[PDB]
Enzyme design. Structure first.
Site, PDB file in Angstrom:
ATOM      1  N   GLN A 143     -26.956   0.535   5.292  1.00  0.00           N
ATOM      2  CA  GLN A 143     -25.997  -0.552   5.443  1.00  0.00           C
ATOM      3  C   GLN A 143     -25.116  -0.340   6.666  1.00  0.00           C
ATOM      4  O   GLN A 143     -24.733  -1.307   7.335  1.00  0.00           O
ATOM      5  CB  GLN A 143     -25.150  -0.682   4.174  1.00  0.00           C
ATOM      6  CG  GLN A 143     -23.804  -1.357   4.372  1.00  0.00           C
ATOM      7  CD  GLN A 143     -22.786  -0.988   3.304  1.00  0.00           C
ATOM      8  OE1 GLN A 143     -22.536  -1.762   2.379  1.00  0.00           O
ATOM      9  NE2 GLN A 143     -22.168   0.179   3.446  1.00  0.00           N
ATOM     10  N   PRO A 162     -20.849   0.148  -0.722  1.00  0.00           N
ATOM     11  CA  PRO A 162     -19.641  -0.664  -0.944  1.00  0.00           C
ATOM     12  C   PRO A 162     -19.943  -2.134  -0.694  1.00  0.00           C
ATOM     13  O   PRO A 162     -20.382  -2.515   0.393  1.00  0.00           O
ATOM     14  CB  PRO A 162     -18.642  -0.104   0.075  1.00  0.00           C
ATOM     15  CG  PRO A 162     -19.485   0.536   1.127  1.00  0.00           C
ATOM     16  CD  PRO A 162     -20.721   1.039   0.443  1.00  0.00           C
ATOM     17  N   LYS A 175     -14.527  -1.036  -4.676  1.00  0.00           N
ATOM     18  CA  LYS A 175     -14.864  -1.015  -3.256  1.00  0.00           C
ATOM     19  C   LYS A 175     -14.349   0.249  -2.578  1.00  0.00           C
ATOM     20  O   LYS A 175     -15.060   0.860  -1.771  1.00  0.00           O
ATOM     21  CB  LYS A 175     -14.303  -2.257  -2.566  1.00  0.00           C
ATOM     22  CG  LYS A 175     -15.135  -2.729  -1.386  1.00  0.00           C
ATOM     23  CD  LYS A 175     -14.575  -2.219  -0.072  1.00  0.00           C
ATOM     24  CE  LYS A 175     -14.969  -3.130   1.076  1.00  0.00           C
ATOM     25  NZ  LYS A 175     -15.101  -2.373   2.348  1.00  0.00           N
ATOM     26  N   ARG A 235       0.812  -1.210   0.000  1.00  0.00           N
ATOM     27  CA  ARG A 235       0.000   0.000   0.000  1.00  0.00           C
ATOM     28  C   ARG A 235       0.849   1.264   0.000  1.00  0.00           C
ATOM     29  O   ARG A 235       0.336   2.342  -0.328  1.00  0.00           O
ATOM     30  CB  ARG A 235      -0.940  -0.005   1.207  1.00  0.00           C
ATOM     31  CG  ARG A 235      -2.054  -1.040   1.118  1.00  0.00           C
ATOM     32  CD  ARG A 235      -2.385  -1.632   2.480  1.00  0.00           C
ATOM     33  NE  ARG A 235      -1.354  -2.548   2.953  1.00  0.00           N
ATOM     34  CZ  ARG A 235      -1.577  -3.804   3.313  1.00  0.00           C
ATOM     35  NH1 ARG A 235      -2.791  -4.328   3.279  1.00  0.00           N
ATOM     36  NH2 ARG A 235      -0.555  -4.555   3.717  1.00  0.00           N
ATOM     37  N   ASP A 254     -18.935  -6.112  -0.413  1.00  0.00           N
ATOM     38  CA  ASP A 254     -17.861  -7.030  -0.059  1.00  0.00           C
ATOM     39  C   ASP A 254     -18.485  -8.345   0.399  1.00  0.00           C
ATOM     40  O   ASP A 254     -19.692  -8.563   0.256  1.00  0.00           O
ATOM     41  CB  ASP A 254     -16.939  -6.404   0.999  1.00  0.00           C
ATOM     42  CG  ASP A 254     -17.692  -5.916   2.227  1.00  0.00           C
ATOM     43  OD1 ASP A 254     -17.203  -4.968   2.877  1.00  0.00           O
ATOM     44  OD2 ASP A 254     -18.774  -6.459   2.540  1.00  0.00           O
TER      45      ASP A 254
END
Ligand code: CA
Ligand code: CA
Ligand code: CA
Ligand code: CA
Ligand code: CA
Ligand code: CA
Ligand code: CA
Ligand code: CA
Ligand code: CA
EC number: 3.2.2.-
Length: 313
Positions: free
Chosen positions: A305, A256, A239, A194, A258
DNA sequence: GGAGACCTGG
DNA sequence: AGGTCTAC
Protein backbone atom coordinates in the site's frame (compact mmCIF):
# COMPACT_ATOMS: atom_id res chain seq x y z
CA UNK A 1 31.08 24.34 9.42
CA UNK A 2 27.37 23.54 9.56
CA UNK A 3 25.55 20.88 7.57
CA UNK A 4 27.92 18.76 5.47
CA UNK A 5 27.47 17.78 1.84
CA UNK A 6 29.16 14.97 -0.06
CA UNK A 7 31.49 17.45 -1.79
CA UNK A 8 32.05 19.65 1.28
CA UNK A 9 33.78 17.11 3.58
CA UNK A 10 34.80 14.03 1.54
CA UNK A 11 36.74 12.39 4.37
CA UNK A 12 33.75 12.27 6.77
CA UNK A 13 31.31 10.15 4.72
CA UNK A 14 30.85 6.37 4.66
CA UNK A 15 29.08 4.32 1.99
CA UNK A 16 26.53 1.53 2.31
CA UNK A 17 25.99 -0.70 -0.77
CA UNK A 18 22.46 0.25 -1.83
CA UNK A 19 20.99 0.81 -5.30
CA UNK A 20 18.26 3.34 -6.00
CA UNK A 21 15.84 0.48 -6.78
CA UNK A 22 16.13 -0.72 -3.17
CA UNK A 23 15.64 2.72 -1.61
CA UNK A 24 14.79 6.29 -2.66
CA UNK A 25 15.26 8.83 0.13
CA UNK A 26 13.08 11.48 -1.55
CA UNK A 27 10.16 9.02 -1.62
CA UNK A 28 10.20 7.60 1.93
CA UNK A 29 11.60 10.36 4.14
CA UNK A 30 8.94 13.05 3.47
CA UNK A 31 6.17 10.58 2.51
CA UNK A 32 4.44 10.67 5.91
CA UNK A 33 6.20 7.83 7.73
CA UNK A 34 8.57 10.04 9.73
CA UNK A 35 8.07 13.77 10.26
CA UNK A 36 11.59 14.61 11.50
CA UNK A 37 13.65 14.62 8.28
CA UNK A 38 14.63 17.74 6.33
CA UNK A 39 16.25 18.27 2.93
CA UNK A 40 18.50 21.04 4.21
CA UNK A 41 20.78 20.79 1.16
CA UNK A 42 19.63 19.48 -2.25
CA UNK A 43 19.49 15.66 -2.15
CA UNK A 44 20.84 15.77 1.43
CA UNK A 45 18.52 14.70 4.27
CA UNK A 46 19.20 15.34 7.96
CA UNK A 47 17.44 13.93 11.00
CA UNK A 48 17.76 12.11 14.30
CA UNK A 49 18.73 8.44 13.98
CA UNK A 50 19.61 6.25 16.98
CA UNK A 51 19.80 9.29 19.29
CA UNK A 52 22.31 10.98 16.97
CA UNK A 53 22.18 13.45 14.07
CA UNK A 54 22.87 12.06 10.60
CA UNK A 55 23.00 13.48 7.08
CA UNK A 56 22.22 11.08 4.24
CA UNK A 57 22.64 11.24 0.47
CA UNK A 58 22.62 8.58 -2.23
CA UNK A 59 24.30 8.12 -5.60
CA UNK A 60 23.30 5.49 -8.16
CA UNK A 61 24.66 2.44 -6.31
CA UNK A 62 25.76 3.75 -2.88
CA UNK A 63 24.13 5.31 0.18
CA UNK A 64 26.47 7.89 1.71
CA UNK A 65 26.11 8.59 5.43
CA UNK A 66 27.73 10.96 7.90
CA UNK A 67 27.21 11.36 11.65
CA UNK A 68 27.70 14.46 13.79
CA UNK A 69 29.48 13.83 17.09
CA UNK A 70 30.00 17.52 17.92
CA UNK A 71 32.84 18.98 19.95
CA UNK A 72 32.41 16.12 22.44
CA UNK A 73 34.34 13.86 20.04
CA UNK A 74 36.63 14.33 17.04
CA UNK A 75 35.28 14.59 13.50
CA UNK A 76 35.40 11.10 12.01
CA UNK A 77 33.49 9.04 9.48
CA UNK A 78 30.84 6.63 10.83
CA UNK A 79 32.13 3.45 12.42
CA UNK A 80 30.95 0.06 11.10
CA UNK A 81 28.77 -0.49 14.16
CA UNK A 82 27.24 2.97 13.72
CA UNK A 83 26.34 2.16 10.11
CA UNK A 84 24.44 -0.92 11.34
CA UNK A 85 21.84 1.33 12.97
CA UNK A 86 21.27 3.03 9.61
CA UNK A 87 20.75 -0.34 7.91
CA UNK A 88 18.25 -1.47 10.55
CA UNK A 89 16.32 1.81 10.35
CA UNK A 90 15.73 1.27 6.62
CA UNK A 91 15.39 -2.53 7.05
CA UNK A 92 17.78 -3.13 4.16
CA UNK A 93 17.59 -6.90 4.73
CA UNK A 94 14.06 -6.73 3.26
CA UNK A 95 14.65 -6.88 -0.50
CA UNK A 96 12.30 -4.63 -2.48
CA UNK A 97 12.96 -6.21 -5.88
CA UNK A 98 11.65 -9.50 -4.49
CA UNK A 99 8.56 -7.90 -2.94
CA UNK A 100 7.80 -5.96 -6.13
CA UNK A 101 8.00 -9.22 -8.09
CA UNK A 102 5.59 -11.10 -5.81
CA UNK A 103 3.07 -8.24 -5.80
CA UNK A 104 3.35 -7.75 -9.56
CA UNK A 105 2.77 -11.44 -10.27
CA UNK A 106 -0.54 -11.41 -8.35
CA UNK A 107 -1.74 -7.91 -9.27
CA UNK A 108 -1.81 -6.58 -12.84
CA UNK A 109 -2.53 -3.05 -11.59
CA UNK A 110 0.62 -3.19 -9.45
CA UNK A 111 3.09 -3.74 -12.30
CA UNK A 112 1.72 -0.78 -14.26
CA UNK A 113 2.22 1.71 -11.41
CA UNK A 114 5.26 0.38 -9.50
CA UNK A 115 7.69 0.44 -12.44
CA UNK A 116 8.01 4.23 -12.03
CA UNK A 117 7.98 4.33 -8.20
CA UNK A 118 10.73 1.99 -7.00
CA UNK A 119 12.64 2.26 -3.75
CA UNK A 120 9.56 2.69 -1.57
CA UNK A 121 10.27 0.74 1.61
CA UNK A 122 9.20 1.16 5.24
CA UNK A 123 11.22 2.59 8.10
CA UNK A 124 11.52 0.79 11.44
CA UNK A 125 10.55 3.59 13.83
CA UNK A 126 10.75 3.76 17.62
CA UNK A 127 7.36 2.96 19.22
CA UNK A 128 7.30 6.10 21.40
CA UNK A 129 7.91 8.61 18.61
CA UNK A 130 5.61 6.71 16.26
CA UNK A 131 2.70 6.45 18.71
CA UNK A 132 2.64 10.15 19.60
CA UNK A 133 3.34 11.45 16.08
CA UNK A 134 0.31 9.59 14.73
CA UNK A 135 -1.88 10.53 17.69
CA UNK A 136 -1.47 14.07 16.34
CA UNK A 137 -2.31 12.82 12.83
CA UNK A 138 -6.08 12.89 13.48
CA UNK A 139 -7.83 15.49 11.29
CA UNK A 140 -4.41 16.72 10.17
CA UNK A 141 -2.27 17.00 7.04
CA UNK A 142 1.40 16.08 6.59
CA UNK A 143 2.50 19.73 6.56
CA UNK A 144 0.70 20.36 9.86
CA UNK A 145 1.71 17.14 11.64
CA UNK A 146 5.29 18.08 10.76
CA UNK A 147 4.84 21.41 12.53
CA UNK A 148 3.25 20.01 15.69
CA UNK A 149 5.86 17.25 16.05
CA UNK A 150 8.69 19.74 15.56
CA UNK A 151 7.30 22.11 18.19
CA UNK A 152 6.55 19.24 20.59
CA UNK A 153 10.13 17.96 20.34
CA UNK A 154 11.56 21.47 20.74
CA UNK A 155 9.72 21.98 24.04
CA UNK A 156 10.06 18.54 25.66
CA UNK A 157 12.92 16.74 23.91
CA UNK A 158 16.56 16.73 25.02
CA UNK A 159 18.93 18.97 23.08
CA UNK A 160 21.47 17.15 20.91
CA UNK A 161 23.55 19.54 18.76
CA UNK A 162 23.14 22.70 16.69
CA UNK A 163 23.97 22.90 12.97
CA UNK A 164 23.55 26.25 11.18
CA UNK A 165 20.37 27.81 12.69
CA UNK A 166 18.85 24.39 13.52
CA UNK A 167 18.96 22.81 16.99
CA UNK A 168 18.23 19.08 16.78
CA UNK A 169 16.18 17.52 19.58
CA UNK A 170 15.59 13.89 20.42
CA UNK A 171 12.05 12.70 20.94
CA UNK A 172 10.59 13.37 24.42
CA UNK A 173 10.47 10.55 26.94
CA UNK A 174 7.35 9.13 28.56
CA UNK A 175 8.17 10.91 31.82
CA UNK A 176 8.34 14.29 30.08
CA UNK A 177 5.08 13.82 28.16
CA UNK A 178 3.35 12.72 31.39
CA UNK A 179 4.52 15.68 33.47
CA UNK A 180 2.31 18.36 35.00
CA UNK A 181 0.66 20.99 32.79
CA UNK A 182 1.88 19.26 29.61
CA UNK A 183 -1.52 19.50 27.92
CA UNK A 184 -1.80 23.24 28.56
CA UNK A 185 1.69 23.83 27.16
CA UNK A 186 0.93 21.68 24.12
CA UNK A 187 -2.26 23.60 23.34
CA UNK A 188 -0.24 26.82 23.07
CA UNK A 189 1.76 25.04 20.35
CA UNK A 190 -1.38 24.58 18.23
CA UNK A 191 -2.00 20.88 18.88
CA UNK A 192 -5.69 21.46 19.59
CA UNK A 193 -7.66 18.64 21.20
CA UNK A 194 -4.75 16.30 20.43
CA UNK A 195 -2.93 17.89 23.39
CA UNK A 196 -5.14 15.91 25.77
CA UNK A 197 -4.57 12.55 24.06
CA UNK A 198 -0.79 12.99 24.24
CA UNK A 199 -0.85 13.73 27.98
CA UNK A 200 -3.47 11.06 28.68
CA UNK A 201 -1.76 8.29 26.68
CA UNK A 202 1.63 9.05 28.22
CA UNK A 203 0.12 8.80 31.70
CA UNK A 204 -1.93 5.69 30.92
CA UNK A 205 1.21 3.85 29.78
CA UNK A 206 3.32 4.81 32.79
CA UNK A 207 0.70 4.60 35.54
CA UNK A 208 -1.66 1.84 34.32
CA UNK A 209 -0.04 -0.37 31.65
CA UNK A 210 3.39 -1.22 33.09
CA UNK A 211 5.50 1.45 31.40
CA UNK A 212 7.73 1.59 28.37
CA UNK A 213 8.37 -2.16 28.47
CA UNK A 214 4.65 -2.77 27.86
CA UNK A 215 4.78 -0.84 24.59
CA UNK A 216 8.07 -2.30 23.34
CA UNK A 217 7.01 -5.86 24.16
CA UNK A 218 4.15 -5.51 21.66
CA UNK A 219 6.85 -6.20 19.07
CA UNK A 220 6.88 -9.84 20.21
CA UNK A 221 3.07 -10.10 20.14
CA UNK A 222 0.87 -10.86 17.14
CA UNK A 223 -0.80 -8.24 14.96
CA UNK A 224 -4.26 -8.92 16.42
CA UNK A 225 -3.00 -8.77 20.01
CA UNK A 226 -0.93 -5.63 19.40
CA UNK A 227 -3.80 -3.84 17.63
CA UNK A 228 -6.28 -4.55 20.44
CA UNK A 229 -3.70 -3.52 23.05
CA UNK A 230 -3.03 -0.18 21.33
CA UNK A 231 -6.73 0.72 21.10
CA UNK A 232 -6.81 0.85 24.91
CA UNK A 233 -4.89 4.14 24.88
CA UNK A 234 -6.88 7.40 24.68
CA UNK A 235 -6.83 8.93 21.22
CA UNK A 236 -5.69 5.68 19.57
CA UNK A 237 -8.28 4.17 17.23
CA UNK A 238 -8.26 1.52 14.54
CA UNK A 239 -6.52 3.74 11.97
CA UNK A 240 -3.83 4.97 14.37
CA UNK A 241 -3.19 1.51 15.83
CA UNK A 242 -2.64 0.13 12.32
CA UNK A 243 -0.09 2.84 11.51
CA UNK A 244 1.95 2.10 14.64
CA UNK A 245 1.73 -1.67 14.08
CA UNK A 246 2.92 -1.30 10.48
CA UNK A 247 5.65 1.25 11.20
CA UNK A 248 6.92 0.39 14.70
CA UNK A 249 5.85 -3.11 15.86
CA UNK A 250 7.10 -5.11 12.82
CA UNK A 251 3.62 -5.98 11.49
CA UNK A 252 4.07 -5.72 7.70
CA UNK A 253 0.54 -7.05 7.07
CA UNK A 254 -1.18 -4.10 8.76
CA UNK A 255 -3.23 -2.04 6.30
CA UNK A 256 -4.48 1.29 7.71
CA UNK A 257 -7.81 1.95 5.98
CA UNK A 258 -9.04 5.46 5.19
CA UNK A 259 -10.84 7.33 2.41
CA UNK A 260 -7.67 7.24 0.29
CA UNK A 261 -7.73 3.43 0.42
CA UNK A 262 -11.41 3.45 -0.59
CA UNK A 263 -10.82 5.52 -3.74
CA UNK A 264 -8.03 3.15 -4.78
CA UNK A 265 -10.10 0.03 -4.10
CA UNK A 266 -13.08 1.28 -6.12
CA UNK A 267 -11.23 2.78 -9.09
CA UNK A 268 -8.36 0.33 -9.66
CA UNK A 269 -10.10 -2.79 -8.32
CA UNK A 270 -13.90 -2.21 -8.55
CA UNK A 271 -14.08 -3.32 -4.92
CA UNK A 272 -17.37 -3.13 -3.02
CA UNK A 273 -18.43 -4.33 0.44
CA UNK A 274 -20.09 -7.74 0.66
CA UNK A 275 -20.08 -8.55 4.40
CA UNK A 276 -21.98 -5.35 5.24
CA UNK A 277 -25.02 -3.61 3.78
CA UNK A 278 -23.31 -0.25 4.37
CA UNK A 279 -21.90 1.02 1.07
CA UNK A 280 -19.56 3.58 2.64
CA UNK A 281 -16.67 3.69 5.11
CA UNK A 282 -17.69 2.07 8.38
CA UNK A 283 -16.09 -0.10 11.10
CA UNK A 284 -17.44 -3.31 9.55
CA UNK A 285 -16.54 -2.24 6.00
CA UNK A 286 -13.10 -0.83 6.87
CA UNK A 287 -12.11 -4.16 8.43
CA UNK A 288 -13.38 -5.93 5.31
CA UNK A 289 -11.27 -3.66 3.09
CA UNK A 290 -8.11 -4.35 5.08
CA UNK A 291 -8.70 -8.09 4.75
CA UNK A 292 -9.22 -7.78 0.98
CA UNK A 293 -5.78 -6.26 0.43
CA UNK A 294 -4.20 -8.71 2.88
CA UNK A 295 -5.74 -11.60 0.95
CA UNK A 296 -4.62 -10.03 -2.35
CA UNK A 297 -1.08 -8.82 -1.55
CA UNK A 298 -0.04 -11.24 1.20
CA UNK A 299 1.75 -10.82 4.54
CA UNK A 300 3.45 -7.62 3.30
CA UNK A 301 0.27 -5.83 2.22
CA UNK A 302 1.22 -2.77 4.26
CA UNK A 303 4.43 -2.34 2.30
CA UNK A 304 2.49 -2.71 -0.95
CA UNK A 305 0.00 0.00 0.00
CA UNK A 306 2.93 2.35 0.63
CA UNK A 307 3.95 1.90 -3.01
CA UNK A 308 0.45 2.59 -4.31
CA UNK A 309 0.17 5.69 -2.11
CA UNK A 310 3.39 7.14 -3.54
CA UNK A 311 2.11 6.50 -7.08
CA UNK A 312 -1.22 8.26 -6.45
CA UNK A 313 0.43 11.49 -5.27
C1' DG B 1 -25.28 -0.70 17.60
C1' DG B 2 -24.27 1.67 13.58
C1' DA B 3 -24.24 11.56 14.80
C1' DG B 4 -22.70 14.76 16.91
C1' DA B 5 -18.37 17.63 19.64
C1' DC B 6 -13.39 18.37 19.60
C1' DC B 7 -9.00 22.32 17.81
C1' DT B 8 -7.06 25.01 13.75
C1' DG B 9 -5.10 26.73 9.78
C1' DG B 10 -7.54 28.57 6.44
C1' DA C 1 -6.63 17.37 6.64
C1' DG C 2 -2.66 9.96 7.17
C1' DG C 3 -9.61 10.53 13.11
C1' DT C 4 -11.26 9.34 17.92
C1' DC C 5 -14.73 9.43 21.55
C1' DT C 6 -19.20 9.86 23.89
C1' DA C 7 -23.96 9.00 23.11
C1' DC C 8 -28.11 7.00 21.79
CA1 CA D 1 31.57 -3.08 2.50
CA1 CA E 1 16.12 6.22 22.97
CA1 CA F 1 13.97 19.14 16.66
CA1 CA G 1 -7.33 -6.00 12.72
CA1 CA H 1 -8.66 4.08 22.43
CA1 CA I 1 -10.78 -1.57 17.68
CA1 CA J 1 -7.85 -2.05 -13.69
CA1 CA K 1 -11.05 15.53 3.93
CA1 CA L 1 -3.19 8.67 3.31
Amino acid sequence: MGHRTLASTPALWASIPCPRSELRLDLVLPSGQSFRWREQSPAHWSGVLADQVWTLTQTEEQLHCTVYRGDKSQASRPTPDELEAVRKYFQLDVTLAQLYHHWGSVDSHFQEVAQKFQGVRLLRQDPIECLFSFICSSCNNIARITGMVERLCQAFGPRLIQLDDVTYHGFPSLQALAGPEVEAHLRKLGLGYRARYVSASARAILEEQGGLAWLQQLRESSYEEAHKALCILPGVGTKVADCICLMALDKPQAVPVDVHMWHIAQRDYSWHPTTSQAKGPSPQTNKELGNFFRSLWGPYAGWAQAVLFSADL
